[PDB]
């Protein structure tokens, strides 16, 4: 079975791998030597060297993350519905988005995050070869070549590098069945091409985050109250709370999302070439091998989150159109959506059979879940209160709607702080100076839950100094 | 009956008058020599020299405007309700407004509109004595003295100068029963004192125009959609459409509004003195005499509109509290208000007996009116669509809510343009250059009513040049 040859984690091997070994470190440190202890979240599992527990290798942990990508896809929504949905979404974006100028090579390079890695093949921090206005040395070569390919409309095969997310998790994912989330890291070449191709559209969409349902680019504090006020114009509210959103995606769906992006781009012919590269079967470097991934979402590119939100919008509209039999453009007259990758809040005036809705979703291969369990139809409520979005609870009072971080999460940020990578999470940062500057984003947030809880959080102690009690509340809710 | 002596237009004469003779001119010119003709609004009546019609003197016209001020007041709302309402409104503002720094003399002077008159006693355009950072000559003296009085917390008697509003009106107010609206022009001294005293509060309130119901300072384009989205969170919508709001006000009500402003000011002791001057019986210079006006709203001061909106809020809450029996702070949990002087939109979840509501209002001496007539309870609707605010119709679609100028009004601005004062409205501006610069605020606005009407308005002709057809629509609705 000559190349692609053999098999890794159920998937075809296309080549030898060049990725660096998976990180054994976390960026999180304890803020105090006192113990947590009980049920407290901690940084995700760090592998064989993880003093906290004996467990499998990070590569084993990663293989587990790769399983869903070889699961069979769910079904396409009915073709007539899918087409009608895409047309409606496309028409809505046509009416809302300000046509943009093409992005230059310069604009694309500047847009990139200089603190993250360049991925294949040099795997170096982008800032290393960055003069401030251009890439130099190795990265300069990789970037210029890609840009030349982009301008000639020539295809390039993206190469993603796999990683595991360093993040706080519930202890069970450490001390029980070990789990750590899969990350896809794009290559500099692809970042350049995707940014030139799609930066214009993504900018246009972002200027539009209040009027359109794709909320990528919103400030929870500043925009949340308006977005939520809009959702509240409608009778019914729900959140499908998806499991494994990315790995359950159909390239067939991603390609329709991609078609909309291409057609709404200022260089659609150049953009088309890039998008075809992005959605073609994916080369994923897992260290030993580069394996072929045909299905699911390939992430880590600039406009991934928008692409992913777009697919979500398509699927969500498909299910509602399937179930209610209402035209997608009419569904959008009678509803307000919020999408951020797999994150969603759906509000609507329509009478939606939640059994048929939950089943339509499942049929597409998605995994919606009840806040509790037993599937078992999704919930539908008549108030917005208590629904969540971007990790905040949506709250409403006489002044308006807002997003509020729960106390658990606020408490959590008190126990942990970011700093350089190290091996033992329980170590405290030794020169425990200042959570900036800012990070009194808690207090107000903490705040928000009332004077009683706010007071106890005012043990923002260090070590200058006060107060700032305690109509920080006024400042957070209304501001400036 | 020694001073105050005799009587003018039903009101006591306190002194001889110093006001300049009422204007005989309009600032409006026709945009074309073609006739209007039928039913077309025109500039209000210009008096004896008005070639269009033979009519009474402007002073007679003004006397008619003064009648309502000697009408008996309506009744105070029940004292327990009034107190509870004031407390609730005060508490709401306490929770929302950012405490402010006191305004300096400099800040107060700069805030004044330099293009309008200084009123009593010099009656000159403010810009005449304005170096750019200070008042000089006569105005400098008047301003410094007032500021000294303000700082010593000493009282001064305001002197208002009466005028008649130059504005487009329906022809019946010209060719039928002649009518022209009364204006009160404050004196520079009082403007200084009111601005130092109340500029801080008014700034604070204005920063708050989306979260609080007093909408003074809103941009219809930018803020309208959010304000309206909020109103739309509620089941029922209404507009009391008041006749003669200002002249029907009770000083007793204005004084409670004033108390809130004083208490929320950074120099409440100094502010109190000013507010007592502002609400004490009013000296109104009508030319021949200064007459005493005890009742109704005395306008023309800086923060009049906020004071007036505040009273409106008090009265509106009183009526709803009287009728529903719900606590005012609870009424505000279940409702969204918009007030701008006499202009209002009231939205609420509560079940309001519209007969009892209309009667409560009338009892306070207000004159609510049905969009048609026959009083006859006010209307209550279950959609926002079709309600008006700041002269715009509130419109909703799949993208959101917005304010839209009606076609009549758009047509109107095509027939007339502003320019220097002249005697014959039908004259066209002879060097018919450019409606700026801008004023393509029509087109988009005109727009908004669809391509069909938008096309016909594109006779924006002059005389360079195009187009700008015709997703100006996109630009007006979403912008920037
Ligand atoms: O709230 C979020 C934020 C990001 N992502 C997606 O998760 C992947 C990165 O972890 C990318 O595909 C993102 O679009 C999701 S699914 N939900
Ligand atoms: O929409 C408006 C705008 C202004 N005013 C008031 O009208 C007077 C000036 O004509 C002042 O008392 C203003 O507060 C009113 S009543 N409604
Ligand atoms: Mg959600
Ligand atoms: Mg109104």
From Swiss-Prot, chains A, B:
Coiled coil: none annotated. Disulfide bonds join 301-303. It is found in: Host cytoplasm, Host perinuclear region. Mg(2+) binds at residues 239, 241, 343-344, 388. Residues 235-356 form the RdRp catalytic domain. Inhibited by Suramin, Suramin-related compounds and NF023. Inhibited by PPNDS. It catalyses: RNA(n) + a ribonucleoside 5'-triphosphate = RNA(n+1) + diphosphate. Its cofactor is Mg(2+); Mn(2+). Changing residue 343 to A: Almost complete loss of RNA-directed RNA polymerase. Replicates genomic and antigenomic RNA by recognizing replications specific signals. Also transcribes a subgenomic mRNA by initiating RNA synthesis internally on antigenomic RNA. This sgRNA codes for structural proteins. Catalyzes the covalent attachment VPg with viral RNAs. Homohexamer; also forms fibrous hexameric oligomer. Interacts with the viral genome-linked protein; this interaction induces the multimerization of the RdRp and enhances its activity. This is RNA-directed RNA polymerase. The lineage of its organism: Viruses, Riboviria, Orthornavirae, Pisuviricota, Pisoniviricetes. The chain holds residues 1182 to 1669 of 1687 of the full protein.
